Design a protein around this ligand. Structure first.
Ligand SMILES: CCCCCCCCCC(=O)N(CCO)C[C@@H](O)[C@@H](O)[C@@H](O)[C@@H](O)CO
Ligand SMILES: CCCCCCCCCC(=O)N(CCO)C[C@@H](O)[C@@H](O)[C@@H](O)[C@@H](O)CO
Ligand SMILES: CCCCCCCCCC(=O)N(CCO)C[C@@H](O)[C@@H](O)[C@@H](O)[C@@H](O)CO
Ligand SMILES: CCCCCCCCCC(=O)N(CCO)C[C@@H](O)[C@@H](O)[C@@H](O)[C@@H](O)CO
Ligand SMILES: [Br-]
Ligand SMILES: [Br-]
Ligand SMILES: [Br-]
Ligand SMILES: [Br-]
Ligand code: NA
Ligand code: NA
Lengths: 90, 92, 90, 92
């Protein structure tokens, strides 16, 4: 559980670093700095307007953006369930 | 677990083949080609703007679209839950 | 499990009957007939735009609408988890 | 289980008392009185338009609003999961 939450924070920070560099210049409101990118990736993790509000607008400039976002959603949500269920048992 | 992930991929692919055919011509931005259709059905599976942003606009042209999307949501949502729980149990 | 799904269908139909009578006249696009109301209550059960898209617009005309919608969400989602987990075990 | 449902109600009430105070004057439609604040925090807890529709507009005026809402989502989401699983286990 402790190791699970550690992995989640590292992946979240690494993903927000990547997102800042990729979309920061073209999408400054969402990815303009590390802070903004961490906030956006949390919104995306919660699945709130991820496609209609974030990813589809991002894909209009960067067609391959889904290669970042879809694996991120698959990875962070699977980890979150694993962490939530893992903490409940212990 | 592997068979579940295989079944989900097959079901997902056929669903996007069907959706391209049904809505492609009338909704090209969301279902105009297999790629776009795989992306939309993923958005639909996550439940993101599925009704307000996709299914209701689709229902304006195709009144029965709900016969496709509602069973799709029910089928994939039950499977993704079963798959994610399946990995957790088969690791404890 | 079989009894759980039976209860869910009855509550869903009864709720869609109630919604048609309550909001049908003022909100015809969402609750104008039993069919429309069943579709809307499914959208509301999945939590998609339930407040921003449906309930807040409904509350502008019917201030107490939340007394219908909030218990519905609480009831149908709890039942759905109970049914999903219940089927997985058996 | 009962203690969990009690803790959630207390946490929910205090959160809506705080939100009324912090955002009431600047966001009256969503946090203008305790009632509106209880309703908004329920919408936020379900994750419905929490960021695009509530938290980002709130962050335009109050840049630190995320310090309130993100821990709120994390706290209530973990509790609601724990409460719902808790009833299921304490019936099997
Ligand atoms: C899982 C761990 C999730 C951690 C989430 C961390 C969020 C950090 C957000 C932050 O530090 N901000 C700067 C606060 O000064 C908020 C930004 O999101 C903000 O600059 C922009 O979004 C603006 O557009 C808002 O008007
Ligand atoms: C659960 C499985 C989910 C699978 C999701 C696959 C999405 C495929 C999306 C895709 O291939 N494109 C985006 C179309 O939206 C096309 C662009 O990469 C191309 O035009 C340059
Ligand atoms: C858990 C069980 C969920 C069951 C869901 C049943 C849905 C039945 C929907 C239906 O029969 N319709 C009529 C099909 O002719 C669709 C309506 O939703 C439609 O009339 C309106 O929404 C219009 O506004 C669309 O343009
Ligand atoms: C998990 C607990 C969730 C509790 C939710 C309580 C919502 C209370 C909402 C409320 O009282 N009003 C709506 C305000 O949005 C006020 C109207 O009933 C009044 O103006 C007529
Ligand atoms: Br969360
Ligand atoms: Br998912
Ligand atoms: Br569902
Ligand atoms: Br809920
Ligand atoms: Na949503
Ligand atoms: Na959701």
């Amino acid at each position: 559980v402790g190791s699970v939450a550690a992995l989640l924070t590292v992946v979240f920070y690494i993903a927000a670093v990547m997102a800042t560099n990729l979309y920061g210049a073209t999408f400054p409101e969402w990815f303009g700095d590390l802070s903004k990118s961490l906030y956006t990736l949390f919104q995306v993790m919660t699945l709130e307007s991820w496609s209609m509000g974030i990813v589809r607008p991002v894909m209009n400039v960067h067609p391959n953006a889904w290669v970042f976002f879809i694996p991120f959603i698959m990875l962070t949500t699977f980890t979150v369930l694993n962490l939530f269920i893992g903490i409940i048992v212990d």
